[PDB]
Structures are given as structure tokens and as C-alpha cells.
Amino acid sequence: MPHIRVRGAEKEKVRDFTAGLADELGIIAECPADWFTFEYVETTFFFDGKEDDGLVFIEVLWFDRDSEARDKIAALFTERWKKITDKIVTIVFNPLIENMYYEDGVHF
Amino acid sequence: MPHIRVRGAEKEKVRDFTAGLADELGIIAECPADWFTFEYVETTFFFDGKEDDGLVFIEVLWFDRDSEARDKIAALFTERWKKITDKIVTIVFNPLIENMYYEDGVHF
Amino acid sequence: MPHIRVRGAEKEKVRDFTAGLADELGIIAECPADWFTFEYVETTFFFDGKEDDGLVFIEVLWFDRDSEARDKIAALFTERWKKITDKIVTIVFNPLIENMYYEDGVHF
């Protein structure tokens, strides 16, 4: 792990968000920077029958860590996006289960 | 919360599905209409090496409520889509965990 | 269930991956081939401020089965993708909860 997914933001803004990001995340999560992936997810928000700006919605798929690491990642992500948008920044952490996760055919 | 995602349907049909929808959902879930987001998710279904019509697949990400609210949302979604398609309508509810969910850097 | 989603690969490669696949999966999981859906998910990987090749990332949404079925599906998927790419092949299994899953408005 970890796998970060962003929806609700422009693709190029997601690319820019990732500059230096795996270094910082690796330090906070105490794991190598190379264990991080980042995606822009292609979606469209709607509300009451119209196109909506939605929000910036970020999923973090990882082997869970304590709340201190989680809280710091949330703060970091929120601070970074708030520089570019006044949209709400929403972050959900999704704990992976080791025996349900495979990398190249074996557990991680 | 709640975050509704739709795949397998035309983007404009997802937009139309959302007309009035957050009012009705807010009433069933007992929360404000403004707490709902809706997305079309860009995906392509395949089956046995060919393009497939797939089904209409709906994810609801929320703080879980009882089965009565869940059952009513499922019925509502199914009835609405069945007006437009004879495709199977599949709905999955995904319970969020409060300490793993952040809005603007704090828990909800 | 089961619902297989692939990201990080070309759309046509996902289509080809699915040739014969539901037969084989049905045999391993002991359920009908028709219970399987397959999607290409439209996403873009980034790393350190640049476009990245990412990896091939596969999600399997299903009613959980034992590790033997899981391990065999993982091996099968990995072997098939390794024929086409030297990218890392990552597979996550996501257990569905029966009372949170609806097909045409009723539980499965």
C-alpha cells in the first residue's frame, strides 16, 4: 500500500498535488515513498438534476495506522488543496486486510 | 456523508436521476439534502472478450443506518432506474467509519 | 456478485483479459459464469508531479470465499497480466455484506 485516489478536481491539479507528496507521506506513514500510488479518477458530480462542482474527494487505501498518522495526512491534504480551491475537501481512509491484498500474486 | 456513485448508465441519465433526489433521500435518511453527493463514474463493462451493457451499479457511501432506511433507498433507486432501463439495478451500501472520515481536515 | 474492476491497463487489454474469464472464475469460485461483471475503470496515475505508468490494479468485489479460492484467482489474474506487461499486478479482494447488497431491489 498506500493508494491515494482523487476525484472532483482537475486532472492537472491532481498531477501537481503529487509533486514531492510520496516523500512527505512516506515520512508521516513511516514507509518508503515508492509504496505510494496516486490517481485522478474520472467522474462527474451532479446535484438536483444539474452539473455540480462537487467537492475534492480523496480516498486513501492502506494498511491502517494510528489516528496520529491519519490525522496528519488529512491535515496535509486539506492544506494543500485549500491553496487551490474553496471546495470542501473530503478524505476517507479505507483499511486493507493483509490476507486480501496481493502484489504480483503473493501477499505484501 | 452520503455519497452516491453510479456506473453502467449514461451520464445524462445519472444527471436526471438526481432531480429532486437529495430531498427524498434526506427525508428517508433523516439528514439534510445538502449532505448528499452524486457521481457518474466513467467505466466500461466487458464480458467474454466483448463490450457488454453491464448493469446499473450504484454505491452508497454513508454512516450506516438501519435496514429500514436502506431497504427504502434501495426500492427508490430501483423503481427510478426501472423506468428507463431493463438492465439489472445493483446497489451496494458501504458503511463509513467516523474516525476515518474527514471534512475540511476534521471529523464529521 | 462478483464484480471485477481493472485500472492502470489499456481498455482493449481489459476487454481481452475477459475472454473466457467468467468460465474459469465460476469454476474456481463455484458459481455461475453469469454472476461475474468486469470493468475497465477510467483513471490516470501520477507520481512526483508527473504522469506515471502506475501498475495494473484489480479489485474483486464478492461474497468472501476462502483463501484457497482467493489465492487461485490471484494467481490466475497475475499470470494472465504478466503475459502482456511487466508492470506490478496488484489485487485487492473486498468482501460484500449480504444485507447491504441489492439486486433489483432485493437481497441476493
CATH number of the CATH domain containing A6: 3.30.429.10
In this complex, the residue of A16, A22, A40 whose CB is nearest that of residue C44 is: A40
Residues of B in contact with A42 (CB under 8 A): 41-42
User: Is C91 in contact with C81 (CB distance < 8 Å)?
Assistant: no
The coordinates were experimentally obtained by X-ray
Pair B51, B61: CB distance under 8 Å: no
Contact call for residues B39 and B11 (beta carbons, < 8 A) = no
- The one-character DSSP state at C60 is E
Q: Are C64 and C95 in contact (CB under 8 A)?
A: yes
User: Could C40 and B41 be called an inter-chain contact, meaning their C-beta atoms sit closer than 8 Å?
Assistant: no
Decide if A101 and C95 are in contact by the 8 Å CB cutoff: no
Give CA separation, A39 vs A93, A107, C7, C54, C57, in Å. Answer: 15, 22, 10, 9, 11
Answer for the pair A28, A73: CB distance below 8 angstroms, yes or no. yes
Q: What are φ and ψ of residue C91, in 5° steps?
A: -130, 125
Question: How would you classify residue A30: left for phi > 0, otherwise alpha for psi between -120 and 50, otherwise beta?
Answer: left
Question: What span, in angstroms and rounded, lies between the C-alpha atoms of C88 and A48?
Answer: 41
10 Å CB burial of residue C30 (0-12, 13-18, 19+) is exposed
CB A55 within 8 A of CB A7: no
User: What range does the domain containing B35 cover?
Assistant: 2-108
Cis previous bond, C32, omega within 30: no
CA A45/CA B19 separation, integer angstroms: 13
CB C22 within 8 A of CB B47: yes
* Residues in chain C closer than 8 A to A35 (CB atoms): none
- State the Cα–Cα distance between residues C44 and A41, nearest whole angstrom: 7
**Three-class DSSP category at B49:** coil
DSSP string computed for A12-48: HHHHHHTTTHHHHHHHHHTS-GGG-EEEEE-EEEEET
Classify residue C102 as left (phi > 0), alpha (psi -120 to 50) or beta. beta
Q: How many domains does chain B have?
A: 1
Distance CA C103, CA B57 (A): 9
User: What is the C-alpha to C-alpha distance for residues C48 and A22, in angstroms, rounded to an integer?
Assistant: 7
Which residues from chain B sit within 8 angstroms of residue A45, using beta carbons?
37-39
